[PDB]
A paper describes a structure:
To investigate the correlation between mechanical properties and functional efficiency in proteins, we selected neuroglobin (Ngb), a hexacoordinated heme protein, which is expressed in the neurons of vertebrates and is involved in neuroprotection in hypoxic conditions and protects brain from stroke. Ngb folds like all globins with a bundle of eight helices termed A to H, and a heme hexacoordinated in both ferric and ferrous forms by the imidazole side chain of the distal and proximal histidines (His 64 and His 96 respectively). The structures of human and murine Ngb present a large internal cavity behind the heme, that is connected to the surface through a tunnel, forming a pathway toward the heme for gaseous ligands (O2, CO, NO). Like many recently discovered globins, Ngb is characterized by endogenous heme iron hexacoordination in the absence of external ligands.
Residue Val 101, located in the FG loop, points toward the heme on the proximal heme side. Its substitution by a bulkier Phe residue was designed to decrease the volume of the internal cavity. The crystal structure of this mutant was not previously known, consequently the reference structure V101F AP, though to describe the effects of the mutation only, was determined. The mutation of Val 101 to a Phe residue leads to a shift of the beginning of helix G (Leu 103 – Ser 107) toward the bulk by almost 1 Å (on Cα chain), while helix F is mostly unaffected. In more detail, the side chain of Phe 101 pushes by 1 Å the side chain of Phe 106 toward the position it occupies when the heme has slid into the cavity in the CO-Ngb structure. In turn, the side chain of Phe 106 displaces the side chain of Leu 103 to the position it occupied in the CO-Ngb structure. The positions of the heme, the proximal and the distal histidines are unaffected by the mutation. Contrary to expectations, the volume of the internal cavity increases by almost 5% upon the Val 101 to Phe mutation, due to the shift of helix G away from the heme. Moreover, helix G in the V101F mutant shifts toward the bulk exactly in the same position it occupies in the CO-Ngb structure, while helix F stays as it is in the hexacoordinate structure. Unexpectedly, the introduction of a Phe at position 101 located in FG loop induces the displacement of Phe 106 in the position observed in the CO-Ngb structure, i.e. when gaseous ligand is bound and the heme sliding accomplished. This may explain why V101F mutant showed unaffected CO affinity.
Author numbering: 3 to 150
Write the structure that this text describes.
């Protein structure tokens, strides 16, 4: 597939500094959907402001975890059915923390933003299309965690 290669080459740029790029993803996410902020409940406390999230070591570890799952998806881009069972359970876990299926699109848009900003002119509409498909495949697996 030409899509597989576009994903791998774009990801190489990003995976060089995953927390820096992840931080972009999340900042953007909270700008688009501020109601996602309270779902992170480290020590039974809620962040007041998005910028609070950025000083929390647990929150930053969660960004690293995110980036690691996407990296797994990229590595398995040629066959993502091998991650299906993990992603389903990852879905279920997020369902339990109070994540809602409709917020997947915001996360998607946030991912695309981060890619668009990191790659600049290298973010071609075919790159965009490829990542949307990848992301969509991930969401479809995770969504099975809402079983139905
Ligand atoms: C964007 C909205 C999301 C929110 C609000 C959110 C929230 C959470 C929370 C509250 C936890 C539990 C505490 C912790 O481990 O830090 C968690 C765990 C996790 N999240 Fe997320 N998360 C989101 C998105 C994602 C996405 C898109 C992925 C992966 C692509 C991801 C991967 C993980 C992983 C790997 C864990 C650890 C799960 C476990 O094995 O226990 N998260 N997330």
């Amino acid at each position: 597939r030409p899509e597989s290669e576009l994903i791998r080459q774009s990801w190489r740029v990003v995976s060089r500094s995953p927390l820096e790029h992840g931080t972009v993803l999340f900042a953007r996410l909270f700008a688009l959907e501020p109601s996602l902020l309270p779902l992170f409940q480290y020590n039974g406390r809620q962040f007041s402001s998005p910028e609070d999230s950025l000083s929390s070591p647990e929150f930053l570890d969660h960004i690293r975890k995110v980036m690691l799952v996407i990296d797994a998806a990229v590595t398995n881009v040629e066959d993502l059915s091998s991650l299906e069972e993990y992603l389903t359970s990852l879905g279920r876990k997020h369902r339990a923390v109070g994540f809602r299926l409709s917020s997947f699109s915001t996360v998607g848009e946030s991912l695309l933003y981060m890619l668009e900003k990191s790659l600049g002119p290298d973010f071609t509409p075919a790159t965009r299309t490829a990542w949307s498909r990848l992301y969509g495949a991930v969401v479809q697996a995770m969504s099975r965690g809402w079983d139905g």
